[PDB]
Paper text:
The RGD (Arg-Gly-Asp)-binding integrins αvβ6 and αvβ8 are clinically validated cancer and fibrosis targets of considerable therapeutic importance. The highly homologous integrins αvβ6 and αvβ8 bind to latent transforming growth factor-β1 and β3 (L-TGF-β1 and L-TGF-β3) leading to release of active TGF-β1 and -β31–3. Here, we describe a method for computationally designing hyperstable RGD-containing miniproteins that are highly selective for a single RGD integrin heterodimer and conformational state, and use this strategy to design inhibitors of αvβ6 and αvβ8 with high selectivity.
Taken together, these data confirm that B6_BP_dslf and B8_BP_dslf have exquisite selectivity and affinity for their respective integrin targets, with considerably greater RGD integrin selectivity than the small molecules PLN-74809 and GSK3008348. The properties of B6_BP_dslf are unchanged following aerosolization: the protein is monomeric, thermostable, has the same CD spectrum, and binds to αvβ6 with similar affinity.
Numbering used by the authors: 0 to 74
Amino acid sequence: STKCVVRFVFRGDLATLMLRAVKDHLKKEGPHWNITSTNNGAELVVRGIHESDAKRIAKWVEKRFPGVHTETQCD
């Protein structure tokens, strides 16, 4: 089945706080998800998720943290 990577890049004075708040939310709904942090705690990478969930979590973060950069790549 298709699997996807989603990358969130937070910018600004609260970027690291935003990343951790979002990571907490995603781990609550996907405790088994492969979620790691890069770019000095400003980039959040979620690996190996279904396309339906990648789009849903993309829309969730963009609605609430509009200044985030969101990239989704599926396989």
